[PDB]
Amino acid sequence: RQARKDAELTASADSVRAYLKQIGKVALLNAEEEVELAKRIEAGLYATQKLAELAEKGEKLPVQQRRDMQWICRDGDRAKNHLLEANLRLVVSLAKRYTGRGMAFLDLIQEGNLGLIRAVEKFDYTKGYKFSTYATWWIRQAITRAMADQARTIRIPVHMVEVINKLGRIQRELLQDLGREPTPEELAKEMDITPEKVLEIQQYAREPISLDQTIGDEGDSQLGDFIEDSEAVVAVDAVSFTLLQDQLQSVLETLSEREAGVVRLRFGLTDGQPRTLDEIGQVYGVTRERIRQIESKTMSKLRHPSRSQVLRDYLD
Amino acid sequence: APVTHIWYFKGVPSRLGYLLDLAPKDLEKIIYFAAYVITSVDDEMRHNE
Amino acid sequence: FFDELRIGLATADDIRNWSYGEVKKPETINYRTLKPEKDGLFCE
Amino acid sequence: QDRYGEYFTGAMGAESIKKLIENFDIDAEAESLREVIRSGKGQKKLRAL
Amino acid sequence: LYRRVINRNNRLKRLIDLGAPEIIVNNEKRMLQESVDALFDNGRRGRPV
Amino acid sequence: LRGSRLGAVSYETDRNHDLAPRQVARYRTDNGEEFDVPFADDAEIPGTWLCRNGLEGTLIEGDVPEPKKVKPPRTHWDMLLERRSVEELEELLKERLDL
DNA sequence: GCTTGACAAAAGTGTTAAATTGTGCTATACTGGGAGTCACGGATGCG
């Protein structure tokens, strides 16, 4: 009945259970059977590039060799595919170390596969070393690079996450020396950096929380309902400025004719572009210092309380 | 690569399954890389003697 | 003005039309200077 | 595939279902179902309906 | 969730470039489909993210 | 608490009857589509642009193709030449002469 | 309704140094996870 069968009905929707069984459809290779594959890959690649090298000039070749070269290329490609498939189990073994540290397990396996690929494009039989020994380093490289590059919503770069890991490991380890969680003094005494930089690093290592968490001992309110907006438009100000635009530009400006005209350009009230002295001295037929003089006259006359009394109340 | 909207792959009824006349489990196997399916076949090598 | 509300099944072309840009990069905001990135999920 | 992979086309995943829906014809199954509903008596009638 | 797409898609864009074996690309496309399914409506398939 | 948005609000005078002169350019894309961009009075004429559809495009007028170029990617063959000389590869090609 | 000239402060150019960011590389050998069930209507089939 459903009680017994349900435990296996979902088995088809678990890539962790299914990939690890579809993976093992090829037996793991040994040392004797991989040098041949590597040599054949190298031969195929070199022949493939020699086709282009010769075609740069153009010549015709015997049919037998013409077909043998293509066979070599294809079968070296097959050798590469076989070698890639023969070590996905090692990839999984290495990847299963990093489970739970942000990245998804299957993503870690895929990145280990990328590391395996880059390893096979450098494994050299001529040195006599095993494929596993060389490829483990590259698998770790790829997996760790990915896990440090995209395991956070905010990307702390490789060089920064590096020092963050150094700080974390030192903080974890040094506790046993004194029985306390190290503070900036103790951390700085061994990180070879000053306390303020350590504080900056600790702040930089911060991670964002989710708004969807539910607070209030009930599943009704949310963390985010009570977020006050600091940017929200306030109607009164929207009104007030308009009134100022209808009080400053409209009334007080219309009291000195051309003498007030300089204020229109000097402060850019009519266009928004402030203008320098000479730039508005040459629109008329006067020098920059004449503009300065008329501006001083206007400032002295307008600054007087008799007119400033109306304009002051906005921010008195 | 292409992708299929989940709301139509399943839901009792599975709109995609009824549209293509495939059972939900058979359709599940195809979409999710578990079995092959024949898209088309040419009669020139089926009725050719 | 509102007379009725239609709910169709969006095709690929409609989805392309609805977007003024493509998200080609997975970062949200720069960890430093706190600004959106050039191709992230928050790009200006 | 090795012995006559040239005679046909087979695929898996959502791409193959894309092709299947592409070649699927609406005018075809409609008549078949309309006939089966009335032609059939038992469960087949309900499935066609 | 969106990132889980943009990542898995991007890596797939790389894997096609490298011409990786069928298993690698099939697994990548399966993960892409699963991630899009989680993005649209989580929990209707398998365990939720 | 107070929340921030990495933004701000302004309320100065909007208008349409007075506007700075646009300089409109159009770009054709490698996917066959064309788009338009209005630029400012500075009279700049950029030759390349990145369009909405996620693909780069070039000015329809067609001035100064390929403005700039970047280092080509490295390839498995280069990665092989870094650990082998041509003589050994030719020797292997000889070794694979027949079955 | 305003000029010549002279000084000092602020707004730009350019070269260089320092820091900040991105990609590659490490060779004994190791080879395939693990996590705390029942109730409801609908598809199939019996006569």
Swiss-Prot record, chain B:
The lineage of its organism: Bacteria, Bacillati, Actinomycetota, Actinomycetes, Mycobacteriales. DNA-dependent RNA polymerase catalyzes the transcription of DNA into RNA using the four ribonucleoside triphosphates as substrates. This is DNA-directed RNA polymerase subunit beta'. It comes from the Bacteria. It comes from Mycolicibacterium smegmatis (strain ATCC 700084 / mc(2)155) (Mycobacterium smegmatis). The RNAP catalytic core consists of 2 alpha, 1 beta, 1 beta' and 1 omega subunit. When a sigma factor is associated with the core the holoenzyme is formed, which can initiate transcription. Belongs to the RNA polymerase beta' chain family. The chain holds residues 99 to 147 of 1317 of the full protein.
From Swiss-Prot, chain C:
It comes from the Bacteria. Belongs to the RNA polymerase beta' chain family. The RNAP catalytic core consists of 2 alpha, 1 beta, 1 beta' and 1 omega subunit. When a sigma factor is associated with the core the holoenzyme is formed, which can initiate transcription. DNA-dependent RNA polymerase catalyzes the transcription of DNA into RNA using the four ribonucleoside triphosphates as substrates. This is DNA-directed RNA polymerase subunit beta'. The lineage of its organism: Bacteria, Bacillati, Actinomycetota, Actinomycetes, Mycobacteriales. The chain holds residues 6 to 49 of 1317 of the full protein.
From Swiss-Prot, chain E:
The RNAP catalytic core consists of 2 alpha, 1 beta, 1 beta' and 1 omega subunit. When a sigma factor is associated with the core the holoenzyme is formed, which can initiate transcription. The gene is rpoC. It comes from Mycolicibacterium smegmatis (strain ATCC 700084 / mc(2)155). The chain holds residues 343 to 391 of 1317 of the full protein. This is DNA-directed RNA polymerase subunit beta'. Belongs to the RNA polymerase beta' chain family. DNA-dependent RNA polymerase catalyzes the transcription of DNA into RNA using the four ribonucleoside triphosphates as substrates.
Swiss-Prot record, chain F:
GO terms for molecular function: bacterial-type RNA polymerase core enzyme binding. The lineage of its organism: Bacteria, Bacillati, Actinomycetota, Actinomycetes, Mycobacteriales. It comes from Mycolicibacterium smegmatis (strain ATCC 700084 / mc(2)155). Induction: Constitutively expressed during growth, increases slightly in stationary phase (at protein level). Monomer. Forms a complex with the RNAP catalytic core, specifically with the beta subunit (RpoB); its binding site may overlap with that of Rif. May bind free principal sigma factors. Coiled coil: none annotated. Gene3D superfamilies: RNA polymerase-binding protein A (2.20.28.270). Pfam families: RbpA (PF13397). GO terms for biological process: positive regulation of DNA-templated transcription; response to antibiotic. This is RNA polymerase-binding protein RbpA. InterPro entries: RbpA_sf, RNApol-bd_RbpA. Binds to RNA polymerase (RNAP), probably stimulating transcriptions from principal, but not alternative sigma factor promoters. Partially restores transcription in the presence of rifampicin (Rif) in vitro; overexpression leads to an increase in the Rif tolerance in vivo, with smaller colonies. Seems to act by removing Rif from its binding site and preventing its further binding. No longer stimulates transcription in Rif-resistant RNA polymerase (with mutations in rpoB). The keyword Protease does not apply.
